[PDB]
């Protein structure tokens, strides 16, 4: 009987609540297969599993957040201690955006605002093919690059010593990385889609937080192409469910 | 013919553009009097006055921002450089929210995420009355406290060594402060009102950045009362325009 815990470090948005019924469903659509049990914990509102229950999960996913992974709010510190414990148990954790950065912070890396500005867009990341086995999480043919909806408010400015870089881009050396066999981290959102992106852009535009030109460029990146969604599902599930 | 420079560290929101025509208008409605020339620079977009033009301003106002004053984007570093020159000239600068934080950074203070978490609401600040002269910026009768629409994402976590604290709140020792006679800084927005605040709360709510109850608590602070808007206008104009003795 397979069990997976999702740590929701963001609230549900109006668009995500109305269109999908919330981030729980978004994650479960993306990374779930039939027959598994998915428990989510709204860690952003201070809800966590008990320490003693961690052993029954076959793996964990840490979502994105509007919070920064360098902040010191009580629920972030508690998430760092929980992740440390999970890590010591050698349980699988997939970290997405904020989640990638949380794992890095727990492993002694440094997270801060992105040197090369924010990103809200579809982009491409270059695979370090030398660091991947044919037949492992990445499939048989390993592509040169993979398209993903990027999350680049923050970044990992100093990489934990134990991390292996699996992909990079021109403006960021840490797009994807693994630690040992049980931590796997991506600075983009496999679980996002064009509708989710376009809604965020329009709202942050209306707020006055980005220029109209930047918004128009962000959306333009998904006018004629989407992310490699099927490949990300395959990679992420192979890692999290030990499927090699 | 008095001239004032406005540094807009923020873009115009949709609500503010369609209701008032933009933040230039909101700042000028708040802080301006007829017969003045106000120039605004969109510093957030890297637009700045020429150095040689600093000398013709009678004063400067630095706006709030959605960016953080501890960040190191090129326009921020350039703002910090320009503020240093203006400070060295001893020209008047009124810093609001991010602007308050930028002046603190230039004068060697530390800015960072608010110790006790964010704030998006009408609040009250307790005045350090011993630090104020009757007849200066706050009038003959110094108030015990003032209501202001708060900006508490970030804060000044370590005060500049030359800062005089003018007001505080339970959770933050630095609501308002001066440096010498030419720098005046408020962690709150005199230029905001109820409509602007509620629009921000609704939008950050829809985005998923705050809880329904945090939004409802924010809005509740302004259901039956507003900020001390006329008093803020008198205070800030008294300082920026030298209308009364310096504190």
Swiss-Prot record, chain B:
Q: Which GO terms describe its cellular component?
A: cytosol; plasma membrane; secretory vesicle
Say if the entry is tagged with keyword Methyltransferase.
Answer: no
Q: Where in the cell is it found?
A: Cytoplasm, Cytosol
Which part of the chain is the Glutamine amidotransferase type-1 domain? Answer: 13-210
Instruction: Give any single GO term for biological process.
Output: proteolysis
Listed as disulfide-bonded, the cysteine pairs are none
**Major location category of this protein:** cytoplasm
* Pathway the protein acts in: Secondary metabolite biosynthesis
**Protein name stated in the entry:** Gamma-glutamyl peptidase 1
Q: Which organism is it from?
A: Arabidopsis thaliana (Mouse-ear cress)
Q: What does the organism's lineage look like at the top?
A: Eukaryota, Viridiplantae, Streptophyta, Embryophyta, Tracheophyta
């Amino acid at each position: 009987q397979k069990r997976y815990a999702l740590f929701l470090a963001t609230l549900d948005s109006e668009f995500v609540k109305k269109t999908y019924g919330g981030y729980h469903n978004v994650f479960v659509t993306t990374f779930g297969d039939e027959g598994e049990h998915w428990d989510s914990f709204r860690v952003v509102s201070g809800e966590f599993p008990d320490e003693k229950d961690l052993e029954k999960y076959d793996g964990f996913v840490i979502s994105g957040s509007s919070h920064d992974a360098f902040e010191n709010d009580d629920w972030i510190l508690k998430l760092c201690d929980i992740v440390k414990k999970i890590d010591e148990m050698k349980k699988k954790i997939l970290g997405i955006c904020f989640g990638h950065q949380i794992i890095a912070r727990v492993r002694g890396g440094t997270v801060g605002r992105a040197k090369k500005g924010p990103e809200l867009k579809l982009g491409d990341i270059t695979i370090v093919k030398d660091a991947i086995t044919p037949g492992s999480y990445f499939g048989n043919e390993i592509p040169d690059s993979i398209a993903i909806i990027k999350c680049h408010q923050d970044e990992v400015l100093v990489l934990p010593e134990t991390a292996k870089v699996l992909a990079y881009s021109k403006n960021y050396e840490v797009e994807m990385y693994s630690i040992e066999d049980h931590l796997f981290c991506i600075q983009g959102h496999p679980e996002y889609n064009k509708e989710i992106l376009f809604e965020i852009v329009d709202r942050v535009l209306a707020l006055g937080y980005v220029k109209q030109e930047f918004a128009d460029a962000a959306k333009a990146t998904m006018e004629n192409r989407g992310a490699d969604r099927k490949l990300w599902e395959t990679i992420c599930k192979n890692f999290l469910k030990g499927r090699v």
